[PDB]
């Protein structure tokens, strides 16, 4: 019924055999056959399929309103499997500010295999239409993007992909299935770095993929079985377990996001704030039409590098570390941590200023997170 | 010093911090930074590096007399990472009877990316020399191969690769580092399905890669970080743990292999037997010169399909299942389980007869395994 | 600061060595010593202390505002360790409706060792004063109790224990440290079945104990080390992880409890409802004075056994299983599942009627849980 | 059939449901019931029974030729459960040099509950007969003992216990079920610290108990369920896994023990050597009649404390740490590490000299262990 109930009872996460109310961890590589070719329950070799992995795959398929789920050893392994749907000579359109690991995989690995890529500003969907080439086979978008939270119209992107015969893919990591369901808007494939919100506890590296398309599912299953970037059973178990609290965690994060943004907008040491909930944000209306909540990632400008470092030092409840979607609130400086290889003038031109700070809001008390960040900003 | 000591004390498998005598399991995705860019112990994000994974990587590097180790989510993920060292238009030479997953990955995935492959009979190394093209960049060999245990001269293959500027790769799964060390014979990269003997307990799917070449190591690290087929920490821990007993397990397996082969050769219901320890086996001398023991995989002919099925039913201690390298002895019929998609006449021409049985010798009592297989053969 | 922040940042749950943001799992039994008697970080043998167990012990000590925490292999192991503080000939006062496992341990195990027990109605604290004997050494109370949710005044019980030289113990399982903190009210020892709300995911059996008393802590540490009912490292890790979401889970449970009770009170197929939030409940005022929220356990009367069974069959979101504090809502019938060995007339006299149903409210959507239970009651 | 086969195929360690060739890890606390009281596979609450724990219990019952197995959170938890078979006023006879944890539990915990104990020299079994009191209910023996490896006649002890109506218990930790089977010699209960050889990898703390007596089994099951010192599922899994290699590990250890003892006896810096394989050892004949191999624990005298410390520093392959039965060879000095609270003159009188060294032989290469210990002794 409602989303919080679906998180508990969606998918198959009990043991039919013993009745165990949690998915058993099948730390196993192979399975007895009673006769050659007769599999007791469809399992024969864990790379091909493992029952704990099947459980997390059923969860992500259910939560995204798809039919087929796939669990990979990381988000970028999920992305690589999806890119491997294509052949040498095929072309992919992606948003211009796609995640750095995705950018790196495409431009330093897959271009060596003849995959062609163009990174365009998908905030206007006619930019996609202009970029379509005779060889284009795939449209891959994140929304909202990192670290400036640019929003792309999913429904229109799906319509463009359908009209031009493209496989459409949405990286739905930042929004999670709790708030945004691209398959419902006509997208072919949705994927996640489950390392972030889905696992939710900073203790699993994993990717998840869902689709309703039987033929794309067969192709993905073949790629997974052949290149072997599969998620192990312990990590699959911890994912199922973490997803149980996704709704509660995202709702707490959203209450905190709203209050933190109010504070940041009022504070004299903060300039521009980047988040899709802000009414003047580009494509705010599009976001509200395709999602019923918000990501916990916020970026905002302070004056310079020294102010950013001092802000980090002065907080009590914001933890300096990579990743996002923890139960802890995390803080980082993209110019120093993710975009340091880009020349400084190009960083500034892209809006990645020396003082741009990114926070990933966690599940601490809202008043504490607001007050802590405010008092730290007061020291600037 | 000696091999059994190196298995216990080689690599770094204790905790410098607490002194724990086993590697802690770092079920974690990210790491506190005390200042931006200052990593306490070199860790920042588990896809890039995880301390439990670093432990198993140090073990495989030590055991293969290499400098750098890499742990992947499966054997075929290790193989795919190694193939991704190449570009569209590059060519690979492999032995003609390479593992089916390797064959499938190369001919159904990587050929779509412009990688070219030729499968040649490497039991005569001049066949490699003839197959070298202007575009050849890699030589990839297993020895002994599956299921007929063909032997390829590693030292000569390394010399050919060096002379022609090829990256040389040995899939050393069947022999393990306990008996065969390709890096010592001049090979650039050695890899394993750790799913088999190294883990040894049929409870981890994993791949391991080692090299002494700093530049190839940098390229592999970049591929691993970018396509993300990494082994998780629980599976890394179970690998380290299983490798502890590798020497004892392989030695027991070898005692049993010798006695079982004597029995099979004497038995009137068995025709040809395939194993490198047999003195009339092709390249027996080459194998003994490059290895100081034997694989536990043996293939042998009984009369027909019905005899193979009856043999399987009549044994008490041979378990019908996929994979090899378990503590249990495993039994299978390649024509029905691995080569069933090949036409029957081509199977027969290749020696994969309907009655060809493959056993993976486990660590049960030698007398029991011999007597059990003999009494089952007596029912034919 | 506030409770939700303390749940994330209270205790020591990161790795000082690598900076890992989660507690490493020390699957280890012993620790290197650099010189005889010099422990690198205070660890020497995991029964005595294990770093992952130390982490969960620091969490429960912090959350209960104590100084010392102890992790046991189950709730009843924690209870047994606490009872072992006493000697043959000593006497314990407990509430009359204490948990069945506690009742069984005391009356079938510890009475064989000369421990004497009396079970009295502690809802009037002068009943405790009357029951005190010259040999009484301990007062052990749960509040609220199972399955009728009787409330005992903790502060007055602590005052009585102090005046009469008794060790006071509160089993705080049903309320959790998020809502009720007995050590702050003067109680000597607080304990939990962490199997329930603290772990929160029905996947760990564990007990936790906290105290501020250095001498009682030394005695408990000695008992734990000598009788060895210690929690293992994987279960300790899963406890730390589950406790992260305790605040969010308990708050969702409480919203649902309030609405479900309104529904039950209005429904013509339901008679008496048992929960401390109901204003006519005995010691409602005491509960509100010693707790700032509610347990998710509710009991209520339907007509008879057949109605209870039909209610269970008609629900979609209530799961028939033992235990409480899951993310799933659980349902049970005490007369058939926990009190079936008590004669029927004595059950009825105690209020455990054939139609008494117990629910443990989970974290599903509030509207779904209310509507589901209501429509199931409509079928009666 | 033979012991090495029984280690692989004895007990139930596969999944009947999926066919998984290893025991699934049931990280779960409770189980769905299809109707009230109908358990799908006999499971209802993990403290009472858990399927992974049931697997390790079936293994230890099979290996000891018993009917019922029990898995506890530590060796001393197993011992405490067995002692709890008795009542206040009952008396236990034990060997005089019983393990320090056992001594401590009995004399500092269970004597407070009215259990009476006498520690007698059981190397002459008529000492047991003299010590029997009207209140004696239990005879508890280790053989061989620590650290001087005293041997007690198991068969005669069982006969004495039967004649006098005593429960007989053997702590079989040092010998393991691979070499010594007390239940076959008439003993009622056998127990192990599975922390040592059975797990074998220094990564699980656990106890195991086996019996053939249905009534004692019912009593132990009740004690386990009521005091809750149960082994968790991950540790149960790691035990099953470690036991697979018990035979290979013990046989390697025994080859090394024989050669090391030869070296120690020949070395001028070593005085007395303590091990049951030495023909002049008291009850050598008894040991050979009740066991078909040897423990890996050896004690031997060097001159003084400084020589012992120097010996430890000079070895490369002997690790200073607590516990025994690792894959690593371990070394310790009882006078400083286990018996330091005993006065020095009483230590000397008992044979625990300042120079007494204890080694636990691991599975490193035999020649390396002999040569390393010899060269270290040469520095004295
Ligand atoms: O602001 C963006 O443009 C952006 C941010 C991210 C997220 N992100 C997380 C870690 C990280 C590391 C490196 C980078 C990049 C360098 C670079 C250069 C050209 C084009 C692109 Cl897309 C990129 S990305 C981005 C990273 N993705 N795009
Ligand atoms: O006897 C061989 O030729 C051989 C055996 C294996 C091992 N193996 C394990 C599982 C499995 C599954 C399928 C197959 C194959 C079908 C096929 C067709 C043409 C060329 C090749 Cl190489 C192959 S392999 C082989 C498999 N690899 N090669
Ligand atoms: O309503 C109560 O009196 C009550 C309920 C519980 C909780 N509970 C959970 C599982 C369970 C199993 C058995 C029983 C009991 C039988 C019995 C007989 C005399 C005195 C007492 Cl205390 C008890 S308890 C209680 C159980 N504890 N007390
Ligand atoms: O040589 C023995 O007498 C002996 C050694 C062990 C094994 N052991 C392992 C760790 C450890 C720690 C303390 C002690 C003890 C102090 C003591 C005092 C009186 C009687 C006894 Cl029995 C004991 S034992 C023994 C320990 N058990 N007995
Ligand atoms: C409500 C519910 C669904 C249906 O979800 P929709 O968002 O309406 O498509 C599926 N599964 C479970 C377990 C549910 O409770
Ligand atoms: C002996 C030993 C080595 C050296 O191994 P080689 O096979 O001689 O290269 C390395 N590490 C450890 C721990 C050893 O014991
Ligand atoms: C606020 C806070 C505390 C203090 O908790 P009190 O309930 O005020 O005693 C302790 N630890 C952490 C991490 C906190 O955030
Ligand atoms: C041989 C065997 C047994 C019988 O063991 P005994 O020592 O003869 O009592 C039991 N189980 C298995 C699996 C065996 O192989
Ligand atoms: Na479900
Ligand atoms: Na669609
Ligand atoms: Na501002
Ligand atoms: Na080492
Ligand atoms: Na080289
Ligand atoms: Na033959
Ligand atoms: Na903390
Ligand atoms: Na106090
Ligand atoms: Na009512
Ligand atoms: Na078995
Ligand atoms: Na008997
Ligand atoms: Na000597």
CB C51 within 8 A of CB C259: no
Give the whole-angstrom CA distance, residue C29 versus residue B229: 31
Beta bridge partners of B320: B331
> Within 10 Å of residue A346's Cβ, how many Cβ atoms?
10
Grouping H, G, I as helix, E, B as strand and the rest as coil, residue D92 is: strand
Tokens of B354: 């309907």
Residues shown for chain C:
380
Report CA dihedral (A327, A229, B322, D26) to the nearest 10 degrees. 0
Tokens of C349: 């006299």
Grouping H, G, I as helix, E, B as strand and the rest as coil, residue C204 is: coil
CB D327 within 8 A of CB B245: yes
Listed residue (D245, D233, D246) closest to D23, CA to CA: D233
CB contact under 8 A, A235 and B231: no
Element spanning D76, H or E: helix D75-83
CB B231 within 8 A of CB B244: no
Distance B249 CA to ligand 12 centre (A): 20
Q: What angle do CA D108, D111, D112 make, to 5 degrees?
A: 85
Strand pairing class (D189-193; D207-211): antiparallel
CB contact under 8 A, C363 and A244: yes
CA A288 to chain centroid: 18
Grouping H, G, I as helix, E, B as strand and the rest as coil, residue A111 is: helix
Give the whole-angstrom CA distance, residue C256 versus residue C240: 25
What does the DSSP 8-state code read for residue A312? H
Tokens of A227: 């290149």
Listed residue (C56, C61, C4) closest to C178, CA to CA: C4
Residues 6+ apart with CB under 8 A from C202: A21, A22, C323, C325, C326, C327, C328, D28, D29, D30
Give the whole-angstrom CA distance, residue D239 versus residue C204: 18
CA C299 to chain centroid: 17
Residues 6+ apart with CB under 8 A from C25: B24, B25, B26, B27, C52, C233, C234, C237
Grouping H, G, I as helix, E, B as strand and the rest as coil, residue D138 is: strand
DSSP E strand boundaries for chain B: 33-35, 38-39, 68-72, 91-95, 116-120, 136-142, 167-171, 189-193, 207-211, 273-274, 297-301, 318-320, 329-332, 356-360
CB D321 within 8 A of CB C32: yes
Task: Give the DSSP per-residue string, A122-179.
Answer: TTSTHHHHHH--TTEEEEEEESS-TTT-----HHHHHHHHHHTT-EEEEE-TTT-TTT
Longest dimension (CA), chain B: 74
Beta bridge partners of C93: C118, C139
Region for D338 from its dihedrals, namely left if φ exceeds 0, alpha if ψ lies in -120 to 50, beta otherwise: alpha
Tokens of A232: 């192990």
CB C244 within 8 A of CB C8: yes
CB A373 within 8 A of CB A273: no
Catalytically annotated residues of D: 47, 99, 171, 196
Determined by X-ray
CB contact under 8 A, D363 and B1: no
Task: Give the DSSP per-residue string, D281-327.
Answer: STTHHHHHHH-SS--SEEEEE-SSHHHHHHHHHH-SSEEE-S-S--S
Q: How far apart are the first and last CA of chain A?
A: 48
D280 Cβ closer than 6 Å to some ligand 8 atom: no
CB contact under 8 A, A47 and B74: yes
What does the DSSP 8-state code read for residue A235? H
Task: Provide the CATH number for the domain formed by B242-379 in this structure.
Answer: 3.90.1150.10
Taking the CA of residue B15 and the nearest CA in chain C, the distance in Å comes to: 9
List the 169-228 stretch of A: residues with Cβ below 8 A of B: 195, 199, 202-205, 207, 222-223, 226-228
Resolution in A: 1.7
C98 Cβ closer than 6 Å to some ligand 3 atom: yes
Task: Among D21, D202, D248, select the one facing B248 at the smallest CB separation.
Answer: D248
Q: Name the one residue in this structure whose structure tokens are 């961890």.
A: A25
Task: Give the DSSP per-residue string, B62-92.
Answer: HHTT-SEEEEESSHHHHHHHHHTTS-TT-EE
B9 Cβ closer than 6 Å to some ligand 6 atom: yes
Q: Is A99 a catalytic residue?
A: yes
Grouping H, G, I as helix, E, B as strand and the rest as coil, residue A34 is: strand
Give the whole-angstrom CA distance, residue C366 versus residue A2: 9
Q: What angle do CA D176, D177, D183 make, to 5 degrees?
A: 120
CA atoms within 13 A on the CB side of C197: 29
What are the residue ranges spanned by the domains of chain B? 3-241, 242-379
Strand pairing class (B91-95; B116-120): parallel
Q: How far is CA B142 from CA B157, B326, D274, D300, in A?
A: 11, 20, 50, 49
Q: Name the one residue in this structure whose structure tokens are 């707790």.
A: C291
Tokens of C219: 């005695």
Nearest Cα residue to atom 9 of ligand 8? D65
Q: Name the one residue in this structure whose structure tokens are 């298995």.
A: B7
Tokens of D288: 């050979």
Tokens of D332: 């310790």
Mutational pocket test of ligand 2: of B75, B79, B94, B100, the residue with most ligand atoms within 8 Å of the beta carbon: B100
> Within 10 Å of residue A306's Cβ, how many Cβ atoms?
12
Give the whole-angstrom CA distance, residue A367 versus residue C265: 35
Q: Which CATH number does the domain C3-241 belong to among 3.50.50.60, 3.40.640.10, 3.40.50.300, 2.120.10.30?
A: 3.40.640.10
φ, ψ (nearest 5 deg) of residue C208: -135, 140
Give the whole-angstrom CA distance, residue D24 versus residue D8: 16
Give the whole-angstrom CA distance, residue B253 versus residue B249: 6
Residues 6+ apart with CB under 8 A from D67: D61, D211, D212, D213, D214, D217
Please check whether residue A135 touches D, CB under 8 A.
no
Ligand nearest to the CA of D214: 19
Residues in B touching C16 (Cβ below 8 Å): 17
In the structure, how many helices (H) and strands (E) does chain D have? 14, 14
CB A296 within 8 A of CB A361: yes
Tokens of A105: 């995989």
Taking the CA of residue C353 and the nearest CA in chain B, the distance in Å comes to: 47
Residues 6+ apart with CB under 8 A from C332: C320, C321, C322, C338, C357, C358, C359
CB A317 within 8 A of CB A368: yes
| From A3, A6, A31, A47, active-site residue | A47
B347 Cβ closer than 6 Å to some ligand 2 atom: no
DSSP E strand boundaries for C132-236: 136-142, 167-171, 189-193, 207-211
């Amino acid at each position: 019924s409602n989303k919080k109930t679906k998180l508990i009872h969606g998918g198959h996460t009990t043991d039919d055999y013993t009745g165990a109310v949690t998915t058993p961890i099948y730390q196993t590589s192979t399975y007895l056959q009673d006769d050659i070719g007769d599999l007791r329950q469809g399992y024969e070799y864990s790379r091909t399929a493992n029952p704990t992995r099947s459980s997390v795959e059923s969860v992500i398929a259910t939560l995204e309103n798809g039919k087929h789920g796939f669990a990979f050893s990381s988000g970028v392994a999920a992305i690589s499997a999806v890119v491997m749907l294509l052949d040498k000579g095929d072309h992919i359109i992606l948003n211009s500010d796609v995640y750095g690991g995705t950018y790196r995989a495409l431009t330093k690995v897959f271009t060596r295999f003849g995959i062609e890529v163009d990174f365009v500003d998908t905030t206007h969907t006619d930019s996609i239409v202009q970029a379509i080439r005779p060889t284009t086979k795939m449209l891959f978008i994140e929304t909202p993007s990192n670290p400036l939270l640019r929003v792309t119209d999913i429904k229109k992107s799906a319509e463009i992909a359908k009209e031009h015969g493209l496989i459409s893919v949405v990286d739905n990591t930042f929004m999670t299935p709790y708030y945004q369901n691209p398959l419902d808007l006509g997208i072919d494939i949705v994927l996640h770095s489950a390392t972030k919100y889905l696992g939710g506890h900073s203790d699993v590296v994993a990717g998840l993929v869902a689709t309703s398309d039987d033929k794309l599912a067969e192709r993905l299953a073949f790629i997974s079985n052949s290149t072997g970037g599969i998620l192990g059973p312990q990590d699959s178990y911890l994912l199922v377990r973490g997803i149980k609290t996704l709704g509660l965690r995202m709702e707490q994060i959203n209450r905190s996001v709203i209050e933190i943004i109010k504070m940041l907008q009022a504070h004299p040491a903060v300039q521009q704030v980047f988040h899709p909930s802000i009414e003047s944000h580009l494509n705010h209306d599009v976001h509200m039409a395709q999602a019923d909540g918000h990501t916990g990632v916020i970026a905002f400008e302070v004056k310079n590098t020294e102010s950013a470092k001092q802000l980090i030092k002065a907080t009590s409840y914001y933890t300096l570390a990579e990743s996002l979607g923890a139960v802890e609130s995390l803080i980082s400086v993209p110019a120093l941590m993710t975009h340091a290889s880009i020349p400084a003038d190009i960083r500034a031109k892209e809006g990645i200023t020396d003082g741009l700070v990114r926070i990933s809001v966690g599940i601490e008390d809202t008043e504490d997170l607001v007050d802590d960040l405010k008092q730290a900003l007061d020291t600037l």
